[PDB]
């Protein structure tokens, strides 16, 4: 039952930087039974290093594996564009799990999000449900906080969030928050506000609408 | 080229059964140590179980979460690895991969030499999708996300199963488009949002249609998003 852990979850670096990825085991894993994998969205995993330090055929020599016992390290000399992906360690001696994975994304300049709010459509309303959508568009870093306030009352438990993968064009993320209510609850209130805090925002940004208009 | 192909994935109800197959090629199948790995939507790789080479006794192993429900089998004569999945649960949903590490021969020659070599090839199949849900197939209702840089979009709500396709203006509009990953609602139905940013000057000039395609239900919806 050896458990593997990876630090950190997200490693933000610039193309050309040197990356150092950690994997730790609760008990020692023999050197011939440790491996590093790479996975990009929509694709199968790819072996990079096996037996702790052996590069797989066809893998560029900028990838390098090291470590012993319970401490293991994957090094990428210079991050190429195709290297921004998820990396998994793996053991295969007496336990056979993968590590939780480390995501390497592109360290970009800070970008505040563009915030938009969308009322429920009239078509959806006459079906008995109301979903109000808040869009945080093209921001960096990935950390963002959306809070719904209905007539100045903080909501909780009635919204779901979705975040895109890091954009392949400008290296930003985007986020949609959907607050879902019934017709009855929606027609009861007037001010629907989406309050956003992000590292690129000096103060919280609110986008709101009034149900009538 | 050594390869692996998975098949058998599909939509099944909780407590139902499913058998996955994995066909290998270009390696001595009887000597291969076979492994099943799975990946839930947006989650990491999870080891499911393996079966040692037949030539080593063929011992099997399983993850605690699937032990007693899943069985791994092997047919060397047909180069096929199997995964019998019983008592399926919703947390079994995901992509399932077949994987092994195999030996390959490398040969080169000089005016003065002949060199033979073996190296490892770690191979994975492209995966097969297992969806365990009690929901019924249903196309989405598409609601406009009306504007008034401007932002507009379409809300693709209450569909099952994955996936759904969204284009804007029949693919003519691709810059500024963000189609978010779906979220699974408490109803067991998926909901998704697709947005696009455009110049505010275009809101009265250009018309915007989101073209939504849900093949499992034979649903095509073209929704015009107006101010």
Numbering used by the authors:
A (entry chain L): 1 to 27, 27A, 28 to 94, 96 to 213
B (entry chain H): 1 to 52, 52A, 52B, 52C, 53 to 82, 82A, 82B, 82C, ...
Task: Give passages from the manuscript.
Here, we describe the structural characterization of an apex-targeting antibody lineage and autologous clade A viral Env from a donor in the Protocol C cohort. We previously characterized the V2-apex PCT64 bnAb lineage from an elite neutralizer in the International AIDS Vaccine Initiative (IAVI) Protocol C (PC) cohort (Landais et al., 2016, Landais et al., 2017). In this study, we combined negative stain and cryoelectron microscopy (cryo-EM) single-particle approaches with X-ray crystallographic studies of early and late autologous Env-antibody complexes to decipher molecular details of the co-evolution of HIV Env and the immune system response over the course of several years of chronic infection. Comparison of Ab-Env complexes at early and late time points reveals that, within the antibody lineage, the CDRH3 loop rigidifies, the bnAb angle of approach steepens, and surface charges are mutated to accommodate glycan changes.
Guided by neutralization data of autologous antibodies (Landais et al., 2017), we selected a late time point PCT64 Ab to make an autologous complex matching our late Env with a late antibody. This antibody was isolated from the month 35 sample, PCT64-35S (late Fab), and neutralized late M18 virus at an IC50 of 9 μg/mL. We solved crystal structures of both the early and late Fabs at 1.6 Å and 2.4 Å, respectively. Here, a sulfotyrosine was observed at position 100F of the late Fab CDRH3. The overall structure of the late Fab was similar to the early Fab, apart from CDRH3, which at the early time point adopts a β-hairpin at the base but is “splayed” at the tip, resulting in a very different paratope. Ala92 and Arg93 are replaced by Glu92 and Thr93 in the late Fab, creating a negatively charged patch (patch a). In the late Fab, sialic acids of the complex-type N130 glycan would create electrostatically unfavorable interactions with the negatively charged surface of the Fab.
